[PDB]
Amino acid sequence: SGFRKMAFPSGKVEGCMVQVTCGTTTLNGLWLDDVVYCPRHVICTSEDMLNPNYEDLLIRKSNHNFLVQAGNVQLRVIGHSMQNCVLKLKVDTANPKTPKYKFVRIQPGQTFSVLACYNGSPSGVYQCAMRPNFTIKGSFLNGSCGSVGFNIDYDCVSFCYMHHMELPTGVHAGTDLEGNFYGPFVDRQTAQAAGTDTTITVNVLAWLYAAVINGDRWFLNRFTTTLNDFNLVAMKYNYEPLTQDHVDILGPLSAQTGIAVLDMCASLKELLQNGMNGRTILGSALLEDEFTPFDVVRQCS
C-alpha cells in the first residue's frame, strides 16, 4: 500500500538528452534516430527575445552554426529545419539508445513525467499534470528549456511536452514535440498571462478512490447526488464540470471499491462545503488533482 506522486522511470529518456548550442545560447535537445529536436529560441540572443522573427534569424544560419554534444561526442549537424516552435537538426549519427517512441499531444487533465535537464544532463524527474489552462506547475531554471515530458506504456515512450518558458505567475508553458504550444502562448518575452485555472474534478475523484483503496475512509458518507446537482456545487468551487464520459472512466475504480461514482461525488461535495477540519487524505490537507484514474489504477493495482 501507500500512494505517492510517482514518475515514470526516466532511463529511456535519459539516453536521448543532448546539448544544443547556437552562438552563445545553450539548451537541451532530444536525440531520436538521426534527428535532434529543440526549442527554436536557441537561435535567439537575449535582445532578440522581445519580438524575434524566427524565420529571419534561421535563414541567417547554416548547419555549422549549430553544435550538438552528446556526452563526450560532438554530433555533426547535416541539416536543419523549423516546425512551428521547434528546430529539427538532422545529425550524421542515429542515436543507438533510441527507444520505441511516439509523439502525442495530450489533453488538459492528463499527467506526465518531466525529466529536468541542464546542458544535456538530467537533473531530476517529477510528475506533472497539464492544467486546464494549458500551463504546468513545474520546476524549471535557466538552461532547462528543451527538457521533455513523457509517459511510458509497456516500453514505448510517448513524448508529449517540451519546455519553453515561464509565465509571471511562476507556472510553465511549452509545446508538443511538433512544436505547437499548449494554450495560447507564444515564444517571445512579451506580457502573457495564463487564463484562470480550474481544478480537475475527475482526477480529484480518482484520488479519493485511491484513498479508499488505501484505507482512508473518514470522508465517505451515506449520501448521494445527481450529476447536475454535483456540477452546480463544482461550478461554485471552480471545479471542472463532470461529464458522463468522466463518470464512465471512473467505472473500474468504482467497481473495485464498491462506491458508486455519484456517491463519491456526494463525498466531494461535502468536502468542498465543509473543508477537511484538520484531517488529511493520503497525507494531503488539500484535494489533489494531478492523478488520473489511470494513474490510480496503475499504482494501486
Binding site: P39, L167, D187, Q189, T190
Partner: peptide
C-alpha cells in the same frame, strides 16, 4: 513578462 527558459 514571459521569460524564455
Amino acid at each position: 513578462x514571459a521569460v524564455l527558459x
